[PDB]
Amino acid sequence: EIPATVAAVKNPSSKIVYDEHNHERYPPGDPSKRAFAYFVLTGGRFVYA
Amino acid sequence: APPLDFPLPGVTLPSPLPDHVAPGKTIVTTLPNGIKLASETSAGPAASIGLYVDCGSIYETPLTFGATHLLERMAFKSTRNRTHFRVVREVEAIGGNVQASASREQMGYTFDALKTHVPEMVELLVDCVRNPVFLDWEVNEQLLKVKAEVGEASKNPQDLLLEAIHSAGYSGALANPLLASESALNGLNGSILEEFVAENYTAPRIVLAASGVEHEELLSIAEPLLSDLPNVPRPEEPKSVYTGGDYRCHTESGHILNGQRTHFALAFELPGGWHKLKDAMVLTVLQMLLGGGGSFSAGGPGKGMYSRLYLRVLNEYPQFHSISAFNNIYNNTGIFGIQVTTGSDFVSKAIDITVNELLAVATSGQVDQVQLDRAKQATKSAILMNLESRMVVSEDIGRQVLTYGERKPVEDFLKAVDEVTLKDIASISQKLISSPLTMASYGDVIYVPNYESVSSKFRS
Amino acid sequence: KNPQDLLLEAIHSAGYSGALANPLLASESALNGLNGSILEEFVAENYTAPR
Amino acid sequence: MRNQRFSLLKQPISSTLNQHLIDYPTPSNLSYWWGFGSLAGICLVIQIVTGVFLAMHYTPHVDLAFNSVEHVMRDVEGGWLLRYMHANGASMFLIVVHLHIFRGLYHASYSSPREFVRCLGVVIFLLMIVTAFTGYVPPWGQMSFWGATVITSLASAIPVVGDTIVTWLWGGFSVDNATLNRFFSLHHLLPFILVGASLLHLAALHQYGSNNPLGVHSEMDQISFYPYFYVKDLVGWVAFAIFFSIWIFYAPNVLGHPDNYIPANPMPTPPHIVPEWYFLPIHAILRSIPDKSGGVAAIAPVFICLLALPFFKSMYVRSSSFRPIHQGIFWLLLADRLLLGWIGCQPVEAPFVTIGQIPPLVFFLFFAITPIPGRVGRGIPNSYTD
Amino acid sequence: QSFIDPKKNWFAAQHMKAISKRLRRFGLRYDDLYDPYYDLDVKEALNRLPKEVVDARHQRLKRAMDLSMKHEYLPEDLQAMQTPFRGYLQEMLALVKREKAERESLGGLPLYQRTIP
Amino acid sequence: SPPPPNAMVYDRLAEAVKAKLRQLENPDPRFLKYGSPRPTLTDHTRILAAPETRVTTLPNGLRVATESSLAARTATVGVWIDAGSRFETEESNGTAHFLEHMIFKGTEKRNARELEEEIENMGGHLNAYTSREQTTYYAKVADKDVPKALDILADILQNSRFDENRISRERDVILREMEEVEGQTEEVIFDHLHATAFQYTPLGRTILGPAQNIKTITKDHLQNYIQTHYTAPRMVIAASGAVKHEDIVEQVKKLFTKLSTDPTTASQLVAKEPAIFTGSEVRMLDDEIPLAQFAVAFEGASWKDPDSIALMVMQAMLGSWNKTAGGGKHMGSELAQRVGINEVAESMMAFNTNYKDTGLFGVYAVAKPDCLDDLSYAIMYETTKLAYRVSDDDVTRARNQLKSSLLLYIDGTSPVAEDIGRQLLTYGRRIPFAELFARIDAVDASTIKRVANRFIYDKDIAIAAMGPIQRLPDYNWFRRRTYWNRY
Ligand SMILES: CCCCCCCCCCCCCCCCCC(=O)OC[C@H](COP(=O)(O)OCCN)OC(=O)CCCCCCCCCCCCCCCCC
Ligand code: HEM
Ligand code: HEM
């Protein structure tokens, strides 16, 4: 039998499964959330200042 | 700005060309000192200017071995009038490519860009060729590079075998290796290269070839720069007499257990070169008739998968890796042979098959009329499709004006192609077979047959 | 560094074709091919009593 | 080499900080029990700054010390904040270091190749205890005077040299102004030695890397320090700041004895003399013996055992996750150590004598037992094999 | 410059005599005092010179340093066979600096940059 | 007393060095007349004259375009189709490449051997190639053989027939060719990059497809593909060389029949199932390989997006580098100078790909496992300085380079026919060189900064690496390095 680690190199499929035991993903197509990240972080930088 | 599906509003369009444009003619001009200027007009918006010299590998005394490879490598670098920085900056500023090449008989410097930069191209190329200053540290860096290159150049068996053939089969001047040797790589410096260039880059050995330039403008630009070179009688060409020999050398013994294949080749010699045009063209037609194959290629069908070699060898003995015929016409001398790759269990059979095939070609009456007609058509079609690019036409003009002194129109070559018949190829092949055998091998040498016994299988 | 033994081995290679043509000072491929089991089997086969 | 510069963070000027803080490789499964070293570093820095600013308003004399402390609290802008931060940050610093020590005991961090780190840690602990005890005196209350008397006169139990060293230590015949000024100078000096020992401790750890909750080889899966453990340290620091400020602002006297607001009076004795809450285990072990020489020389086995743990050389598995019996012994030792702590603050009669004499026996049976699991379990692969 | 020239000015001559005397004492040339750690152009100029010249420079430096350690000076005869102010480094240094300037004019990046200490 | 300047072995060599350096200094004005290294913008209106492209649309929607030059001696005739591996159905994934391979055997009127011997007896040859969005079948022939070649093309496209034995033989040969391609580890890099950037979309798949799918690629599927995706409006016929437009159009109108008249264009099949860029990584660690290889990609423009010219200029101004190039360490751009001066990489090449409604933009270096940190730092630093501090000389040089490249690549009959066909499928019209120029020199520093701040600054990335990549910075390093806190 072929190694599990080599069957994933010569088979560039595009259907990928992550580990959702901790973090869920947004459905594909949805925008990013960079602005909300800056929004959340400024509220603590104020306090530290 | 609008999307690209909608035309820009404020552009001015120069008028087009007619569907029929009468092609121009090659205008060849020689200066009093022997400098030959040639040019031709073209239709595309691009130009191509070359500079070809008669020097080469054969003009190489044993104290200056390996000089041609560096002369190729030190191509466009620090001149007497500008640095290497400025040269690279100029070339990239106008947006042009630049390249240099060296072979066993003639040097080639090329430079192409758009057609509105012709004076800059001419001036820069003439300066980079006529006034080079060889600086020791740049040459040292190039020497390190070529050391690393030659140390690892054993990944091409084809050219190594061809070099072995050309080294064993000859004895005179033409036996030198175009690729250099570690002795040369530890013997070369700036002074040697400067003296070599000073000795061999005279006036009667230089020709300018352009592809898309009016003759008068190019002449006006290149007259003040090249007319000052002194005139000097050209030294007499060296000589080499064909001498049948044999070559063997096993691969590094760390790569034998991998089942490395067996390689070898055969060869013969032609008294004529390029001055006997009919014989050379017949040899070209014969080479296209034999064809060959690679067992792995995926290119065009028209490559000759219904040629003699492919059908009558590979489809009959599948054990082969690769069969192919090759030739290398020189000035006053030619070469022909066959190179084959197969495992270490079919070797002597391969020699028998290839010698049988050569003798089958030799004997009269063995070639069908369809075969000759197909070879003729393929050869002429290949020539005409080759002549499309501007690079090819500039190189052709330069090489032809070096060899014959005048350009020979394509119609003449086509006429000479049509004159080929069965008796002519028969007689020419008879002349091929009437010469001593050259052989060489590579890979697992311990199985290749002897020279004398195989030689006896042929004629005198 | 020893051209004399090199020439002797070259002579015994070219001038002979049978068993006497085998190499004595080995080459790199066999070296990459050798391990404990090969030497063990060689010794087991060829170190017999009558010899 | 890189014949032209790339980054400021790899230049020679910042090479040390970069290599030991930013790009240093750490295991990727470190938990929240690995933040207390940094947290203790911040506690030490807080102590140093607050002390350098208290020592601008304090006068070391027997007539003036009490009134100068009260002057600080009543007449200087924000001085009450400085005094409360100092007097409670000592307690926070001890709490954090105790948690650090018990982390080290759990996942067996003293074993090879990390015994130099353990030995330097023990030395640091001694310096900490000396500094805190010397600095509890300068306010010059009742407990300051009588604690100094008891503890520093416990050094005449030694044979012939005893009275001489006690009298040389006290600078005279009793605890008076000379002892006060002496202790003030020692208190201002020791924390810089503490800083130096901490830096040496960190270098000794960085020359082999840290352990992990598994106790296995960890060179195949590592991540850098920034930004992956910087943010975890940040979480820890903010929680610690909330806790510290709950102490400072809404209950600043719960962790002290009321008797230190009475100026020192050498004639009357308090009815119940004890030191701070973080010396009570040692104090209970010390009074557990009905003999001066034995009582004083029973502290020495404590430090000898703590300093000789690393040199048993048969145990092969580090983390207590795969060691049930040693894990149970760890929890039972923790309970017994808390019991010593509670006993150290009680009057000496029944039924506290027996309960003060047995827990020392357990506290020493811990350091006696552990090699026996080492041996009995070195041969475990041969019995349970499949 | 005019007054820097020895043959006109009359101090300048005294300055030249003093410097030549001080250099002849230890048997080294004025171009030895340059340092590859100062400029990094001296590094390139010495990296382009032939090997024999750099080797002679190293031997002269070692000789002078041994003399200075021992607190003594070369004998009078070897002080007569001396010749300071016979350069081997100025033209190459000018070439390297001129190439540096010409590269600075046309954009580009420097070929070697000093480390931040 | 001191030795004369020729009496010692080092004095002589010093004197020789000084003599050569004097030989090097004083230049000749007559060689410095026309050249100058400082770039300037030129006016190329005197040479852009070209023969006119004549486009004809038959009443079937089909398009015929030519470029008639009656002086040549050879001609190129081909068919460009608006189809590819993108428009498949997740079950027939490799069908396009399989169909391309098997198209050259059928044609029940003509068995394979007779057809191949015709074309070899004719003197010309025909090739093919497929991609995710454009398939091609074209032939090179001589002037007298154009009607014969066009007849062959029409027959092979319209009357193809498939047989089971040929299917099995093709199946095995394509398994062999799949096993052949996994050894150059660059198309592997780009297949994994295309499969990670566009996961769960059509553009994420591969042209060759699975083996577990080539197992069951039986004939009816090929017939369905032909009858479904080779429709008259979606096809283009192009020709160059010695031809005439009227002759070709009348022969085509007489010959091209029996084509399925499906009223379906590419607009509907791309309007649904769009191409969304996600942003992720794939790390393939081997560590028995001597060299590491990786690519990092932003998102790009489309064909009709008015910013593709700006992206091309940006790619030109982030040019390539290789260890055998003659440029060396004086190579115009900035990333090339860093990579070449510090010997950090083997080779690198800025790339730029356009699709309808999406694209890509990246770097793709090759290096030893010892230099990856410096390489990645230089890459990201220059990529973002693009959006911060672009200069005038760089933009002028990039514009000149792009003009020269785009014209020098159009050389010969086959490149011209390919140009006409692909520009009639992507744009719907062939843009004359004058409009290419007038659009190119209208991209100055301000537009470079604007497009860079639209595409590069603070956006997600996709990475793919292979080899000894244990020393390659993690995702967060790359992601944070796409903006600067200094400004
Ligand atoms: C309160 C009064 C205290 C007075 C002192 C009391 C001391 C009691 C200590 C009892 C514990 C026993 C100590 C024995 C030390 C040496 C034992 C040992 O095993 O050393 C050997 C070992 C390497 O030898 P090895 O390779 O194992 O043998 C080869 C055989 N072919 O060596 C090693 O593995 C190297 C380990 C080095 C780490 C330990 C270094 C000493 C501890 C550092 C603390 C000192 C720092 C103080 C700083 C301030 C100084 C004032
Ligand atoms: C001022 C006092 C102390 C400071 C500043 C300090 C600081 C640190 C730091 C920063 C680390 C590494 C980071 C971490 O693992 O959390 C560490 C590790 C360690 N410390 Fe301390 N510590 C102190 C006291 C002690 C004491 C008293 C002991 C033991 C009696 C000790 C034993 C250890 C051990 C065993 C480690 C090993 C860490 C590991 O196993 O990964 N430390 N210390
Ligand atoms: C340079 C470092 C330090 C200086 C200058 C300093 C200064 C002082 C001063 C002046 C006092 C008397 C003021 C008062 O008691 O209210 C004091 C008390 C005290 N110090 Fe420090 N200190 C330093 C570090 C430390 C450290 C590191 C610790 C503990 C680890 C510590 C523990 C104490 C304690 C417990 C008190 C008792 C205060 C009370 O209980 O009321 N000090 N310090």
Ligand SMILES: [Zn+2]
């Ligand atoms: Zn294919």
